[PDB]
Amino acid sequence: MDGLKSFLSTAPVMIMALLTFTAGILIEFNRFYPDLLFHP
Amino acid sequence: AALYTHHQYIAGFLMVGAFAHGAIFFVRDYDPVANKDNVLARMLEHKEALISHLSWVSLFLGFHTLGLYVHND
Amino acid sequence: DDFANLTPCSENPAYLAKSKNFLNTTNDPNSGKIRAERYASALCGPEGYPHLIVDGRFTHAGDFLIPSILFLYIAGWIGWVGRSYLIEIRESKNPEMQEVVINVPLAIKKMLGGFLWPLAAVGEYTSGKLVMKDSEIPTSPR
Amino acid sequence: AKVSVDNNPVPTSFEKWGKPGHFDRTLARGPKTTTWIWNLHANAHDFDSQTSDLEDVSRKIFSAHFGHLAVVFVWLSGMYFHGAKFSNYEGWLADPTHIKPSAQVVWPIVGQGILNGDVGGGFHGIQITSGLFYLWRASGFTDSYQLYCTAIGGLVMAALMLFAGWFHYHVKAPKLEWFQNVESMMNHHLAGLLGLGSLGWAGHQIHVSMPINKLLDAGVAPKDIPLPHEFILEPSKMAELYPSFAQGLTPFFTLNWGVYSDFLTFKGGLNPVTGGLWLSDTAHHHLAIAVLFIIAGHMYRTNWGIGHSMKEILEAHKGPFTGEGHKGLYEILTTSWHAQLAINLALLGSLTIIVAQHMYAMPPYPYQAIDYATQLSLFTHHMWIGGFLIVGAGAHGAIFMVRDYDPAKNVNNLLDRMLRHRDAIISHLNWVCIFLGFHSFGLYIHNDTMRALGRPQDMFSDTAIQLQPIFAQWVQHLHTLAPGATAPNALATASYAFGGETIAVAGKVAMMPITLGTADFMVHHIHAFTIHVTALILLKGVLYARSSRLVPDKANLGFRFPCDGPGRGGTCQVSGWDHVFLGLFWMYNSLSIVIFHFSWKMQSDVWGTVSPDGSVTHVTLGNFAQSAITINGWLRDFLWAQAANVINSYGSALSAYGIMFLAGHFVFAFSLMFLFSGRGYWQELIESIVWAHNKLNVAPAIQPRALSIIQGRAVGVAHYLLGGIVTTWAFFLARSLSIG
Amino acid sequence: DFLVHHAIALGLHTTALILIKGALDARGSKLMPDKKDFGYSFPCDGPGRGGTCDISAWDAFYLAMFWMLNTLG
Amino acid sequence: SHSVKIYDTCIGCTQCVRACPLDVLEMVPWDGCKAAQIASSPRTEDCVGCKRCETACPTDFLSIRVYLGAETTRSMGLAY
Amino acid sequence: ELSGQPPKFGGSTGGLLSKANREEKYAITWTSASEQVFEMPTGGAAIMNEGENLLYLARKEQCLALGTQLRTKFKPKIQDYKIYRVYPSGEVQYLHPADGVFPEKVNEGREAQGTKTRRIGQNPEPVTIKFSGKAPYEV
Amino acid sequence: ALNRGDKVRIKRTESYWYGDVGTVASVEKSGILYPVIVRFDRVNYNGFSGSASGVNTNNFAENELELVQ
Ligand code: CLA
Ligand code: CLA
Ligand code: CLA
Ligand code: CLA
Ligand code: CLA
Ligand SMILES: CCCCCCCCCCCCCCCC(=O)OC[C@H](COP(=O)(O)OC[C@@H](O)CO)OC(=O)CCCCCCCCCCCCCCC
Ligand SMILES: CC1=C(/C=C/C(C)=C/C=C/C(C)=C\C=C\C=C(C)\C=C\C=C(C)\C=C\C2=C[C@H](C)[C@H](O)CC2(C)C)C(C)(C)C[C@@H](O)C1
Ligand SMILES: CC1=C(/C=C/C(C)=C/C=C/C(C)=C/C=C/C=C(C)/C=C/C=C(C)/C=C/C2=C(C)CCCC2(C)C)C(C)(C)CCC1
Ligand SMILES: CC1=C(C/C=C(\C)CCC[C@H](C)CCC[C@H](C)CCCC(C)C)C(=O)c2ccccc2C1=O
Ligand code: SF4
Ligand code: SF4
């Protein structure tokens, strides 16, 4: 529905979706490659 | 330790008072027409740039210092 | 002879003594050993922890320079896409409504075009419409 | 039938989801400044201001209450699921005295797997302090499958609550006359909810909880104990455990109730095996209150002319000093939701305060008294809940006074008389607050100065000038003698706090007599001072919300306004909302002192380890009596001494608490940005920053604005309370988990 | 010492920001174009036009005293 | 007592007079605006300084300004 | 001089103080078309009687608040109230409305007061008027 | 000189839109000393504490406006 699409596109939903995307990226990277103090 | 703390606190109080009484001067004793286009007037011209870059440097120091301290903690 | 007070971690007795008992950060059982290996090439202090040297030297470029370039690229990407989206929506009829309800199509279109942000920024500066003139900006009374 | 509804009043559509701010006329137009955002999140659930029709407001309230019920159901189902899948409840059940409860497991990602400490039995996880394990053991839980089924049922109930809200608003909305059947509502909610709930719980306990707990306390392994339905299916086991069950239900209908004495006792005290209350005592208790509540029902006239009328009772109780008496209150409490909210919030907050103060003295759950962390956590948590609810009562009462109070319907009634001698009330209350604070806190400061000057014989202590609480000692003596003398059929005292023997389980003191001395006198009167001051602030907010000698028209200005202006010398913080904002801090202060007193007294005079000989060694020894009389004693022997376990928590499983401790100390300080400053400075700073962003042609369309004065105060108080409470929470949890 | 010296730098720049913005905005700003007519120290300009609440330069000094104390600490 | 001044940018919307709770302001005939009326402050000794008139003024900057000055019993708005 | 039956009130602690007999008080009088309940500015509700009324208050702001309530919160709008200042000696000074016409609407014969012939941005700089007992708005 | 639809820059030096640009909504032809009416996209600070909007219209004299269009 158009109203549902408009609600999903509001500021809090976008900000939280982007934050979870970034957090998932960082968490997965830190899981598969932890303890990166510098480019060795 | 007592002497260092005492004279440093005195210095801080005096440094605050200098700016306070300078603001008092700007309120009371500043004549825009007499000090026209000179350095004193030029200060009030790019004051927005002054405050903006000062805010940027304060935020830049605070964010990345608190981040380092909290990261270490 | 630089950093006479900082010794390599590969020989610092404190670092070698403390690297045996490195805790496992992840569920991998040998993450601590990997961390000890990776940190054995750094410059440890008397207490055995790595120290980062930031003075411009390229021998320690991994401490600051590479993360600096990475962060600068990412931050420029974010700022450029945000500014472009703002300027784009500013010509519409309800710029404020599109500020709270994000135009996801246009938003993503600007999202994907931000990897060339340095070239776009330099072209913007040369075109002269990156920076407004001082006489075209509202200012507070002096 | 008194049911009256309207069919499909509001269509179910998604369009209004795409237009935030639709409820408000001032916000649905579209944002021009950032304030439009903050208003949107602030005026959302204020249905009274949105529309003038009372019926629509009542419908919205009904469905919103359905929504909160659904949320609470989801929370309960989540608790049960996380106790069923990620907990050592089955392990703890076999060895309750050697395994710490734990129901939260932490993923190892960035080293937070260190939080998964060793809780005993080979299980690694975060120790819980809610006491859910003891409640589940008392309820008869023995397997994780039952907990999983409970979680599934909770999720189903949450979905049903959501559907109920949708149906009873968007489809079949009740009429106003339906909501105002206060007699019918009170009857159904006293007899059908409290009485029936108590009867059902008594039935569950008698037919499920007592047999399982009796077998568990004897020494039977959890897996050997029969499943709860097998007791009902084969009553032979029930008759074996309790002989009177062989008699069946015949004595109940013939009033030969005494035969049921074996499983319906009046023992009183604590169960030696578990340290909790006897389940037979609880069974007769909940049965008795069920009978009492069902009898308390059938009291108000609903449909058959047989019953009392609330309006008649209210208008009949009037006297010489009170003019019209309780006249017009029925119309107040049947036309304004805010007055009902105020009364219910005050009573409920006091109720949770009573719960906190009574659940620790007579611990109802098995193995709860010996788990000091759970005791402290439960006490402090429900204490804070009660304080917040009381402050909310003080707020929403002033809201009612500003909005729903009408002088036409209140002439010479109790409300008007209250509004007439309000100056006398406030003046006398202010005097009593000053007197209490002066004399009590001056006893404290006087003791501090006497100790600092090397004259301990001039202090206010048990060795020095006594100041003994003779009345509290007398009532403790009376309650200690009550079994046999004034309650002949009781076997032991209501609790061992008043007096008696020392009940200790697993070499840990569960409950021993709590002696009151000079320090207890001082702290109790300090509590009285703080409570009277908070009451003074909230009462001044409620009474003076309409007007005052300074501003005679505050009612027209609204309930939430920052000031009237810099005139009249300055009129800052005159609204009722400002009185709530000021009372929040004093509630925090009073409750902090209360929880500090509870923690220190519990650690110093009750909790501890009992030797095989019988000697009791307390957690902090007997230092409360000789240290809690000076502020320096409170600072050194309580904060500095007991904060060691939270400052030395780094590198261990408790490290998170330590982190959170510092977190609190941060946010509190952060709040001082908003409380100490004003919005013009921030507005000018935002002007400069807006010039900066404008120079690069990146200025936002939604013009940024500094927070409003009211918003600034609200943000300051919120972050302040959050920081302080988080600090206290981390400190208490670390200390209580580090004292065995 | 590196971290604490950079924290001190943050404190100095923030206190300077507060004092300097007060001194420069003492004459007037967008919220109060005619602040000089009201003197150096006045309470506010009422709840209107947004709220004012410490728009005077004396209030800037009062706010900067806290940051001076924190930096000295 | 406080001072109240009305400048020539007034448009004669009379909002300031309506907003005044102590009846300090008045509407007098004028010619500088379309409404041909301007605000006045004859009874300025009763002003308390609540700035409601300033809040009510819709001009780009307040055509009515209140400067707080000497404080009397009336200015403090005292009932005792 | 001042006539009118006082409204029926039970008495409250929010009323007058020694200032009334020491400095001054204020009186408000109005004609009511029906005996009906209104709200005291000092706290409480009192009934006002058919015909003349007379009420003594401590501040002019309270009197004008009562006048606003009379004008707004009653369908038979009461537009005839009069506010006087009563001195301890006995002098009564007519305060509101000044000329009998409400200040909200413009009436001829009034005199402009406090009106400046310039705009707010044209005020003189303080430095040009310092060491004199004047302020930029005073000039 | 200034007509409808004219984009003008404000030089009142104390208004909220000093240096900003607005459009001429109307001009009144009489002895009025601030006859030009200019409306702006942005709104000023006008309003009580907590209001969600300001004022986007004002009156100016002819001499304090610079034509841009
Ligand atoms: C040589 C130093 C010096 C001199 C000559 C002045 C002179 C002046 N200042 Mg200035 N000032 C100074 C240093 C100085 N200041 C410093 C260092 C600061 C920063 C703290 C300030 C901050 C300042 C402000 C913010 C203001 C002035 C103002 C003024 C003017 C008059 C008002 C005044 O201060 O009197 C009145 C002073 C007081 C009433 C001081 C009361 C405070 C007391 C002394 C504190 C006592 C503490 C207490 C007793 C502790 C007890 C401890 C016990 C419990 C053990 C005057 C021109 C005011 C102005 O605008 O006038 C033009 C004004 O607003 N000054
Ligand atoms: C510990 C308390 C504390 C903190 C953290 C700050 C922080 C700040 N103050 Mg401040 N202030 C404080 C107390 C504090 N103040 C007190 C008590 C006063 C006296 C009234 C003042 C008076 C004051 C003035 C007068 C001014 C400041 C300014 C500033 C900013 C300067 C930038 C900076 O230092 O680093 C950068 C900022 C930070 C490091 C803070 C951000 C910290 C968080 C954790 C970052 C992440 C946000 C987080 C994700 C949000 C999640 C929320 C979610 C959970 C709901 C900054 C926001 C100045 C300013 O605005 O500069 C532009 C300024 O003009 N403050
Ligand atoms: C009060 C309720 C409550 C709370 C606080 C928790 C808390 C927790 N649960 Mg839990 N749980 C609950 C109820 C609750 N549960 C219920 C009712 C069930 C039964 C269905 C479960 C079943 C459950 C399982 C099966 C597991 C947990 C786990 C966990 C832990 C990890 C957190 C997590 O799952 O995030 C994980 C991270 C995310 C969920 C982030 C994903 C992105 C989110 C959803 C963003 C939301 C927006 C998204 C984009 C979708 C858009 C929606 C939009 C249209 C509105 C955490 C302690 C885990 C655990 O403890 O493992 C050891 C685990 O495995 N829970
Ligand atoms: C026996 C009849 C009965 C019962 C049990 C209730 C119970 C309740 N009413 Mg209620 N009510 C009744 C009759 C009843 N009402 C009548 C006759 C009227 C009209 C005069 C109202 C009008 C009314 C209003 C206007 C409101 C309530 C509300 C509530 C809830 C308050 C929240 C609470 O107590 O948390 C405790 C919560 C629980 C114990 C969870 C109970 C979950 C369901 C709904 C209970 C169903 C029980 C049912 C008998 C089936 C169980 C039998 C068997 C399966 C074991 C509560 C669930 C409030 C609300 O919105 O809540 C929805 C509210 O505002 N009532
Ligand atoms: C049964 C409980 C109950 C109910 C139904 C209401 C209902 C209402 N209240 Mg009330 N109130 C209550 C309890 C309750 N209150 C209590 C206990 C207090 C004391 C604190 C108050 C104090 C209060 C005030 C001061 C005001 C209301 C107002 C209102 C009205 C709606 C506006 C509102 O608050 O929504 C909007 C709600 C919010 C914006 C809350 C969001 C911000 C919260 C505080 C953050 C909480 C953070 C959380 C605790 C931790 C998060 C940590 C983070 C890191 C994630 C409405 C009639 C307002 C009114 O005037 O209505 C007429 C109003 O001004 N209430
Ligand atoms: C127990 C020892 C420790 C506590 C001691 C403190 C007691 C202090 C005062 C004595 C209580 C007297 C109540 C009689 C008073 C009484 O019963 O009044 C009843 C009386 C109403 O009489 P009527 O019969 O007219 O009332 C009809 C009613 O039914 C209304 O419809 O009310 C008044 O006269 C006005 C009340 C004045 C109240 C004065 C305020 C007192 C505030 C302080 C009270 C503090 C108690 C705190 C501790 C609880
Ligand atoms: C283009 C763009 C924008 C705008 C950008 C603008 C307008 C930028 C303007 C910048 C200005 C005006 C000035 C900048 C000055 C920069 C300086 C002075 C840099 C100094 C660097 C130094 C001193 C380097 C120091 C060492 C260098 C060395 C490599 C080691 O580390 C050691 C160490 C730290 C000592 C935004 C913000 C709008 C959006 C962005 O996405 C893109
Ligand atoms: C290193 C070295 C050196 C060098 C040095 C130097 C170079 C220094 C400098 C220094 C500096 C360079 C300093 C500065 C400082 C400053 C400050 C401290 C400032 C302050 C200011 C203020 C306070 C302000 C105020 C005011 C105002 C605002 C307005 C009016 C006026 C006035 C002024 C009042 C040498 C060679 C010798 C030797 C070797 C070593
Ligand atoms: C700092 C400060 C400001 C400025 C602060 C502002 C403008 C608030 C800025 C908030 C930012 C934009 C967001 C931070 C809070 C959000 C809730 C964070 C949301 C995070 C999720 C998206 C993850 C005031 O306006 C103010 C007003 C009155 C008294 C004191 C003060 C005051 O102290
Ligand atoms: S300081 Fe703020 S709250 Fe106080 S009177 Fe002025 S504007 Fe109102
Ligand atoms: S509110 Fe302003 S514009 Fe309107 S009449 Fe009063 S002074 Fe003139």
Numbering used by the authors:
A (entry chain j): 1 to 40
B (entry chain b): 367 to 439
C (entry chain f): 24 to 165
D (entry chain a): 12 to 751
E (entry chain b): 513 to 585
F (entry chain c): 2 to 81
G (entry chain d): 3 to 141
H (entry chain e): 2 to 70
What does the paper say about this structure?
In addition to the isolation of two types of RCII complex (RCII* and RCIIa), a larger 450 kDa complex consisting of the RCIIa complex bound to a monomeric PSI complex, which we term here the RCII/PSI complex, was also detected in the preparation. Additionally, all the particles were pooled to generate a consensus PSI map at 2.9 Å. SDS-PAGE analysis coupled to immunoblotting and mass spectrometry confirmed that the isolated complex contained the PsaA, PsaB, PsaC, PsaD, PsaE, PsaF, PsaL, PsaK1 and PsaK2 subunits of PSI, the PSII subunits D1, D2, PsbI, PsbE and PsbF of Cyt b-559 plus the Ycf48 accessory factor. Other regions that could not be modelled in the RCII/PSI complex include the N- and C-terminal regions of PSII subunits and the N-terminal region of PsaK1 and the C-terminal tail of PsaL. A peculiar feature of the RCII/PSI complex is the opposite membrane orientation of RCII and PSI in comparison with the standard PSI and PSII complexes embedded in the thylakoid membrane. Our current understanding of the biogenesis of photosynthetic complexes would suggest that this unusual PSI/PSII orientation in the complex is artefactual.
